[PDB]
Amino acid sequence: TYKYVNKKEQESEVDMKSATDNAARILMWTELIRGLGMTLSYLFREPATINYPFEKGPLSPRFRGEHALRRYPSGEERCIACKLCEAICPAQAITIEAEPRADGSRRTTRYDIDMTKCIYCGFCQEACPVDAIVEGPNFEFSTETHEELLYNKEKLLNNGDKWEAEIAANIQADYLYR
Amino acid sequence: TQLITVDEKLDITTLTGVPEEHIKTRKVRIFVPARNNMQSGVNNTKKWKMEFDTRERWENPLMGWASTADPLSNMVLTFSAKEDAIAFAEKNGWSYDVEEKKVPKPKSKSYGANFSWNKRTRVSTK
Amino acid sequence: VYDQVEFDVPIGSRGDCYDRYLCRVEEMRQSLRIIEQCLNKMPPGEIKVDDAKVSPPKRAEMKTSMESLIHHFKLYTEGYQVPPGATYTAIEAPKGEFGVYLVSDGSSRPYRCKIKAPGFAHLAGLDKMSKGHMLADVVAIIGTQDIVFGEIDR
Amino acid sequence: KRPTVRPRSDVTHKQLSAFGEYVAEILPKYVQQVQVSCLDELEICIHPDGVIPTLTFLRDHTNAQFKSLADLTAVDVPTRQNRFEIVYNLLSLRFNSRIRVKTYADELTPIDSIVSVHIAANWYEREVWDMFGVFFFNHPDLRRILTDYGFEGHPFRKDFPLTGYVELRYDDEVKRVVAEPVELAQEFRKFDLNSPWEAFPAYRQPPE
Amino acid sequence: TSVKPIFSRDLNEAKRRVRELYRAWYREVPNTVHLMQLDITVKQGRDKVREMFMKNAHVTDPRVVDLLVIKGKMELQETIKVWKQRTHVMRFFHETETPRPKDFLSKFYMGHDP
Amino acid sequence: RSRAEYVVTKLDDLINWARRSSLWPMTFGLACCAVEMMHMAAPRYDMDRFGVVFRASPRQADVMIVAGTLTNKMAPALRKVYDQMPEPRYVVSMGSCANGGGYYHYSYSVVRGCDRIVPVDIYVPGCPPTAEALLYGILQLQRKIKREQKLKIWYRR
Amino acid sequence: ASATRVIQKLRNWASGQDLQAKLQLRYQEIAKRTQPPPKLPVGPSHKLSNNYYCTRDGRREVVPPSIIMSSQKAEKKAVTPAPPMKRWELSKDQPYL
Amino acid sequence: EMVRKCDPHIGLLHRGTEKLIEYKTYLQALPYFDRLDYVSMMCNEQAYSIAVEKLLNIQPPPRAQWIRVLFGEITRILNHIMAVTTHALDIGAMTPFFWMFEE
Amino acid sequence: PTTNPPTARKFIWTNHKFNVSATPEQYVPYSTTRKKIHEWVPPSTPYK
Amino acid sequence: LHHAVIPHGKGGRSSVSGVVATVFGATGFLGRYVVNHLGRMGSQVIIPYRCDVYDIMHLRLMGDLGQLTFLEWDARDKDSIRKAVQHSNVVINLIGREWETRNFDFEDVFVNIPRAIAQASKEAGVERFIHVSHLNASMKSSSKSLRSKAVGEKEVRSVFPEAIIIRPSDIFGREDRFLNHFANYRWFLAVPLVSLGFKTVKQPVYVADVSKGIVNATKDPDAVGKTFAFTGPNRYLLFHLVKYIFGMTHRTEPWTTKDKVERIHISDVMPTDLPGLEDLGVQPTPLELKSIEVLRRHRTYRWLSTKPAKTVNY
Amino acid sequence: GSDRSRFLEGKRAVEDKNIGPLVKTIMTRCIQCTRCIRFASEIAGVDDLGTTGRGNDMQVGTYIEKMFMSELSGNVIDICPVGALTSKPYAFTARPWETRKTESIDVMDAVGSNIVVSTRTGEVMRILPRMHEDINEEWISDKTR
Amino acid sequence: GVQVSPSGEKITHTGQVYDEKDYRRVRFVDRQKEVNENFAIDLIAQQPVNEVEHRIIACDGGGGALGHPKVYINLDKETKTGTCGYCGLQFKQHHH
Ligand SMILES: NC(=O)C1=CN([C@@H]2O[C@H](COP(=O)(O)OP(=O)(O)OC[C@H]3O[C@@H](n4cnc5c(N)ncnc54)[C@H](OP(=O)(O)O)[C@@H]3O)[C@@H](O)[C@H]2O)C=CC1
Ligand code: SF4
Ligand code: SF4
Ligand code: SF4
Ligand code: SF4
Ligand code: SF4
Ligand SMILES: [K+]
Ligand SMILES: [Zn+2]
């Protein structure tokens, strides 16, 4: 179906009272006065402003923030150098180099993610088969140089060790949906 | 009235916009790509491919990434025919090296050869 | 399920900025009506197509089953292969008609993807709309044409 | 019935086949092929000489009334002689239908512009020229619309590199924004994401 | 070996269009240098235009010459109404790029590029 | 230390406090990130409450917020607008596009980061980074220009 | 929601609308940030029998387009691409504004 | 005060999106549509999803279709707010811009 | 995290660190791979 | 050589030229052009600075990611000098002032800082040291700064015997204190020229030419242990130079000091035995060609939209 | 194949072997296609590999701790369709989608075997054979590989 | 554990360290090279061997869906513990 936004039914004639009403409207600024009144009403409401940084905007456990590399509860790195994260990474922001470790484990020697190239889409954390790479909820990591956003394996492991108390809780809260 | 004659080799290098270095100094390869021997499928050996000669890839001083200086490093073009690839290469002015399609030779496969009376094709295991 | 929901279509009568603004507001109201209908008629069931060769399986199924792991691997490395052919899919974007012309060669990557923008045609028609008008008038025409430039430029 | 398979209605296929026969027999001088896809979309492939009569007939016919041009695009397939396939998607509001008209061109044979038929074809053909280098005859103002000012080469062609040939940076010695031959700190890693096994036996080409 | 002409039946009026385009470019170079405040002089801008023409001068296909004339008209018109800026005009000179000498010894000393 | 250096340090404190309390930007806004910029201008986060005035001219601007994808066709305009801005000027790049090209890093018509054109003071990572995170970047910029000691450097000249 | 009755009456009169009924600030009616764990259902293909993939392979049912006429391969009433579009009925809810 | 001719020069945000999409896979090219129209994200996602689903001859489940329609109409509300409030901001009024951006 | 504390792991940082940008303790990137091509070492004794 | 210092690439922004250069006067006027050329070919440029990070901020766009390393230093901190020159193969010294402060004077700036820098460079074992002196700062000159630069040349050659010493003439450029200085004489009533500027002969040299010469001296094997004279192609009288700059403008930190006017009125010597820009591979561009981009900012609006001064052999 | 599993039981697991420093064996992945056994019997001509056991417990390998090192012994890594017989120098190094393929010629002997050099990020990562029926068929020597 | 080179620079868990004469340590001049202190090889070496009663064990890394894909380890060799390829946990069959 459809409806008219500006068409009006038939005619309302030209009556002296209607003419006087229109003349009063465009001589005494009635719509202007009512617009002033409801802007005054918003002057008298409560502002919707939170007190940053002492108050933070609400979020969800699904939030895709700063990247991090997790661990098993034993302490072993969860990553097994399988390169699906860089295979699926739509911005090609992940570079991985790998070799067998001294005990023969399949581990990475290089795991670099470029924050300046990353689009923060979570494809790595949803393609990771062992929940190694995650987009933890950190977003307040703005840097003063372009280099500091060029993360490597040591920086990502440090982020994972720092945010493990929250990343694991978010994964516990949300993993039944995914 | 609306049909003229041209007796040339269809050179469009002045309109392609490519710099003259990446026209004159480049060599292209026209070939059916070889089957990846780690698999047995042959669907990737159906179409002709043109690629360019490999240029320098060095190491980034900051991250160790593979830095390059030529734009035609990931340029691979797909053709349905060797003559189509030839026409495209001569039209774009690139010097070409072409190798013919390596087809697998037909083989006489016989399951009964594994159990021969006198030939050496009899197997000792299965 | 737009055939299943019911709503009204705002239709102008003068073809100006005022009528377009009224149409956009009544579209907001009808959108709220459709939101009410969707909230009332949300059905239960699965969330993706139950086809692991196109949509990835669940993570528990991926970590338990062999086929699910294989399909997850192939979908997140190579992706699903789209059969070759061309389509033009157009939907009612809020800014107009959003069109996608996909040509697929049979591989896991699209051979051609043309994005048709309503804003491209609207800003092409900006010059016709600005005839006999003003600076604030052409600013208002740009505002009422619903112009975004990422979609225009691509 | 099947929840994972798209439902198919054959009435649209029959209607589009009938209309394809209709257009093909009305214009045998230009129409080279008529096909209806499995998606119930009508494609009519015509000679480049008949772009103006075909578009005018589809816009102005009583049975067609394809007064709205959906889009105008080009596809670069550099294995055929006329490598640019120009595609016109049109919409008929009177009959609630959509049609596609295809034609071909190469780098040196321009095709007639349809600005006189549809006005959006102005900017759309400007885009096609800027991205592919297909010239258009009798255009009001054919020029670049998306590339940089003085950009050399047509970037949507298949043989054009993804990263391009030049890159811009601010040089303090000349106090300008200058163009350099392109050098990447990290090269774009190409991925060979093609399975060696055939996926769709319905599209199995015969061997050469 | 028979094709459809674009604008020129043969090389003669194609060269006529080339001469007209070169004439208009030669006219516009001083106006370009004066209006867009170029560091260059009028002489070397005309030399740049001339050696661009000599760079394209080796082609004798009438269709390619017509398309080159068309592209030159687009560049010229883009210079007439000033959308192409000072940076875009100065991109023709490559004054910020160290050129590569063409001798084998220098190309050997730099790297593996032929 | 000397009594004069204490007065110089207090003068630096006053000047830096003025510059960080009154931070008027123009947002050289291009895209998604500019939409998220005006979501930071929105009443929830209130940079106007922070002292940061929405929609200022480049002649009256202190910091340029590079918000979106810098293309080759737009980079001379970016440099010209940056040159028109007065000398005490800072640059907050925001988003992966303005940081390092981002999702269009390997594009033929995209500048790989706006730091190739203008000197960036602070990079804000995300695509788009939240308005919460951009306001974090602005407060980090205020701390950074609080750390400046210009009269101290001039006295130690 | 913490506004006094005088300010509430002033706001309601000044705006012409009942504002306390529909407050734009969420206070307590929103959902809890901690939720009970869900159990998502499975799709129609989660069965142990009569579930061969060839019976539900929609990707493999795509055929090449049917050539109606080709230049190398290939009294009736005139037709339209579709029947003409039915005129839209006016809205029975609110036809005019 | 007249507007005699208007020529909009564009390409200032040209990103080579189609070339990048044809150089990437379908799932990798999905978030390009989020940044094509950066106000109508779910709608561009829905259009691309319907196109690829048509080419794949598959259909999403009814719950997914209902969710897609619901967030498409939420996105329509977002985009119409964007259009109306930026139009009013260009004309000169910004309080509805602030109000609707809280929404 | 007083009624429901997080799970304790030995690799979790016991001291939280804020943003350390433009500090001596900031992050500096480097290639975490070792040397890939090993050069020939000439002998330390003359042939004559 | 080390494996990380081998040159690679085509010489672009992301290429490696194998040059690890610590540039000490990089925050000045010649230093920005030197750093621009180094980062343009692609090099590891270490910038020790003592001014504000805001003052050095314009240098950040001028190389690739990680190819520029900014670090604070003090002229009285030889530990900071050693930490700046510890990992480098070229050390370039551009430290200089046109006036004297209460903390640093001409002797300190032109002798003690270059001697300490070269001593630390020799202790760290860098391969190449380049020191920029000034032309006609031979010895016993009338101004104190030229004598200080002569003593600094002697000390640098004493502590680092193979140091490349470059003596340019009065360098002109966009941010110079020569052409902008002569343009800023117009703000007074008239032109204060001693003997009406006829006795002084000058050949100014372009800042980009000097920076190209410095970079080619870093990369040149034959420049080791040599002294170069970086001069323009044409010699002008001071009065003819003032006439040319005023007629090109079309019109008609102290501003100036006694040492500055003494160096202005000191004539430029004839470079005869010394090698020059043509010997380092740089063609000296003239002031007539590279003067419009400098003096345009001093013109009026009517004159926004001139015969050269004549050249003498002596 | 199908897109899901009905296998609700526990999978079998097979202990690995140590047939040499070239071929790494993870025999749990083996699908018992006897390609390696047939190759070793017919082309390598060693008769060292085989199947020991019966039924689901039938294991491919060597019954004794025997080191399978002849020439032409990387071709079992080539022709093993599963990743049961992998290359130990190539272990955990790269991926086939990221490796670029360069068709070259081997110079280790004078046969001139056609090969593919698999190079990733400007570094030679692997050597594979090329199909050439007149030179080397489908195989290359161990020294070449 | 984290060890230091003769240059004084910490060696990463990948074994990477800069040489004495390498110029690339100027990026660590006046800054720090951060190395993750927890070494995964040492941490998995500290783990005791799980002593199970079955010839074939199943590992998912713990937590069910929160761990790695479930694999089966064959504990037939009595001279060597079976190692999980994902989590690195070691298992030993109890034959007493
Ligand atoms: N400029 C000219 O026309 C000519 C210059 N020269 C010589 O070339 C060199 C560079 O010239 P130019 O750029 O014009 O000179 P500047 O006046 O610009 O100063 C050069 C650099 O020296 C630094 N510097 C000055 N005093 C000290 C100090 N006490 N301790 C540490 N650093 C200090 C400055 O840093 P900061 O910003 O911290 O003060 C600046 O980066 C100088 O040695 C000069 O004598 C030779 C011929 C002509
Ligand atoms: S979130 Fe970033 S790193 Fe992960 S796949 Fe997406 S773009 Fe790549
Ligand atoms: S997908 Fe996960 S386990 Fe695989 S390489 Fe990436 S981070 Fe490592
Ligand atoms: S960084 Fe992401 S959100 Fe920002 S402009 Fe680029 S694509 Fe849009
Ligand atoms: S070739 Fe591989 S899968 Fe086949 S029997 Fe041998 S080890 Fe098993
Ligand atoms: S990649 Fe193949 S061989 Fe390896 S575990 Fe998976 S199915 Fe088995
Ligand atoms: K194998
Ligand atoms: Zn495990």
From Swiss-Prot, chain B:
Cell location: Mitochondrion inner membrane
Residue pairs linked by disulfide bridges in the UniProt entry: none
GO CC, alphabetical: mitochondrial inner membrane; mitochondrion; respiratory chain complex I
UniProt topology in membrane: Peripheral membrane protein
Record carries keyword Transmembrane helix: no
GO biological process, one term: proton motive force-driven mitochondrial ATP synthesis
A molecular function (GO) term: NADH dehydrogenase (ubiquinone) activity
Gene ablation phenotype (knockout): Reduces the levels of assembled mitochondrial membrane respiratory chain NADH dehydrogenase (Complex I) and the rate of Complex I-driven oxygen consumption. Growth is retarded although activity and behavior are not affected during the first 4 weeks. With aging, results in increasing lethargy, rapid deterioration of motor ability, weight loss followed by death. Mitochondrial ultrastructure is normal, although large subsarcolemmal clusters of mitochondria are present in the soleus.
Cleavable signal peptide: none
Keywords for this protein: Electron transport, Membrane, Mitochondrion, Mitochondrion inner membrane, Phosphoprotein, Respiratory chain, Transit peptide, Transport
Residues modified as Phosphoserine: S124
Functional summary from the UniProt entry: Accessory subunit of the mitochondrial membrane respiratory chain NADH dehydrogenase (Complex I), that is believed not to be involved in catalysis. Complex I functions in the transfer of electrons from NADH to the respiratory chain. The immediate electron acceptor for the enzyme is believed to be ubiquinone.
Record-stated family: Belongs to the complex I NDUFS4 subunit family.
Gene assigned in the entry: Ndufs4
UniProtKB/Swiss-Prot annotation, chain C:
Organism (species): Mus musculus
Family affiliation: Belongs to the complex I 49 kDa subunit family.
Recorded name of the encoding gene: Ndufs2
Record localization: Mitochondrion inner membrane
Domain of life: Eukaryota
Disulfide bonds: none
Chain sites annotated for binding [4Fe-4S] cluster: C17, C23, C38
Role of this protein: Core subunit of the mitochondrial membrane respiratory chain NADH dehydrogenase (Complex I) which catalyzes electron transfer from NADH through the respiratory chain, using ubiquinone as an electron acceptor. Essential for the catalytic activity and assembly of complex I. Redox-sensitive, critical component of the oxygen-sensing pathway in the pulmonary vasculature which plays a key role in acute pulmonary oxygen-sensing and hypoxic pulmonary vasoconstriction. Plays an important role in carotid body sensing of hypoxia.
Null mutant phenotype: Knockout mice show early perinatal death and major defects in the CNS, compromising especially the postnatal development of dorsal cortex, corpus callosum, hippocampus and cerebellum. Neonatal neurogenesis and gliogenesis are deeply impaired.
Record protein name field: NADH dehydrogenase [ubiquinone] iron-sulfur protein 2, mitochondrial
Subunit structure: Core subunit of respiratory chain NADH dehydrogenase (Complex I) which is composed of 45 different subunits. Component of the iron-sulfur (IP) fragment of the enzyme. Interacts with NDUFAF3. Interacts with NDUFAF7. Interacts with CERS2.
Swiss-Prot record, chain J:
One Pfam family in the UniProt entry: NmrA
Essential cofactor(s): FAD
Primary localization class, coarse: mitochondrion
CDD domains in the record: NDUFA9_like_SDR_a
Keyword Nucleotide-binding applies: no
GO molecular function terms noted in the UniProt entry: NADH dehydrogenase activity; protein-containing complex binding
Modified residues (N6-acetyllysine): K154, K307
UniProt subcellular location: Mitochondrion matrix
UniProt remark on cofactor binding: Binds 1 FAD per subunit.
Sequence positions bearing N6-succinyllysine: K140
Record-stated family: Belongs to the complex I NDUFA9 subunit family.
Role description: Accessory subunit of the mitochondrial membrane respiratory chain NADH dehydrogenase (Complex I), that is believed not to be involved in catalysis. Complex I functions in the transfer of electrons from NADH to the respiratory chain. The immediate electron acceptor for the enzyme is believed to be ubiquinone.
Official protein name in the record: NADH dehydrogenase [ubiquinone] 1 alpha subcomplex subunit 9, mitochondrial
Organism expressing this protein natively: Mus musculus (Mouse)
Lineage of the species this protein comes from: Eukaryota, Metazoa, Chordata, Craniata, Vertebrata
Swiss-Prot record, chain K:
Subcellular location: Mitochondrion inner membrane
Transmembrane segments: none
Tissue: Brain. More abundant in neurons than in astrocytes (at protein level).
Binding residues for [4Fe-4S] cluster 2: C30, C33, C36, C80
Every 4Fe-4S Mo/W bis-MGD-type domain range: 99-145
Role noted for this protein: Core subunit of the mitochondrial membrane respiratory chain NADH dehydrogenase (Complex I) which catalyzes electron transfer from NADH through the respiratory chain, using ubiquinone as an electron acceptor. Essential for catalysing the entry and efficient transfer of electrons within complex I. Plays a key role in the assembly and stability of complex I and participates in the association of complex I with ubiquinol-cytochrome reductase complex (Complex III) to form supercomplexes.
UniProt record similarity statement: Belongs to the complex I 75 kDa subunit family.
Subunit structure: Core subunit of respiratory chain NADH dehydrogenase (Complex I) which is composed of 45 different subunits. This is the largest subunit of complex I and it is a component of the iron-sulfur (IP) fragment of the enzyme. Complex I associates with ubiquinol-cytochrome reductase complex (Complex III) to form supercomplexes. In astrocytes, less complex I is assembled into supercomplexes as compared to neurons. Interacts with MDM2. Interacts with AKAP1.
Record-given protein name: NADH-ubiquinone oxidoreductase 75 kDa subunit, mitochondrial
Organism: Mus musculus (Mouse)
Higher taxonomy: Eukaryota, Metazoa, Chordata, Craniata, Vertebrata
Gene name tied to this protein: Ndufs1
